[PDB]
Write a protein that binds this DNA or RNA. Structure first.
Ligand SMILES: [Zn+2]
Ligand SMILES: [Zn+2]
Ligand SMILES: [Zn+2]
Ligand SMILES: [Zn+2]
Lengths: 73, 72
DNA sequence: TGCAAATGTACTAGCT
DNA sequence: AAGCTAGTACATTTGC
């Protein structure tokens, strides 16, 4: 029914940077590329990213964005 | 020379029965008072150090309880 | 309390 | 019109 972001499963708003994603992942990805962050995972570089757990691990969120194909060109 | 028994930061005193940093003092008070329906994105054994304690409320609250924090 | 960083929404710019 | 996304400003969250 409702389009699903391929990063967090929140409702997708469009195809952003090459990948159907939600509003919060679009801006999260651009800020992650062009910004400095000490994103450090606390598990095994392998976390679950869903609508809640996405805030838990930005390191694994960024990782799953890239594995989904996001790119700024 | 005083380490937090939850995250290992500069403990600021004995809070809710446990030597703990300021940040863990406040986090446990918030967690214990309201819902703590937190969720872990890993395997319920996330590393909870000064850097990564922000990452997993669920594992942090679990560690608070393991260390003995309570409202005595 | 304050200050600030991170995150998320809603909106505008600009294209076709 | 219609439909799209990238950007941006604002608000909210979260944390010292
Ligand atoms: Zn998303
Ligand atoms: Zn992770
Ligand atoms: Zn602590
Ligand atoms: Zn965890």
């Amino acid at each position: 029914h409702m389009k699903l972001c391929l990063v967090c499963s929140d409702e997708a708003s469009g195809c952003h940077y090459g990948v159907l994603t939600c509003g919060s992942c679009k801006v999260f990805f651009k800020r992650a590329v062009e910004g400095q962050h000490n994103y450090l995972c606390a598990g095994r570089n392998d976390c679950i990213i869903d609508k809640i757990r996405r805030k838990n691990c930005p390191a694994c969120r960024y990782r799953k964005c890239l594995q989904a194909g996001m790119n700024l060109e």
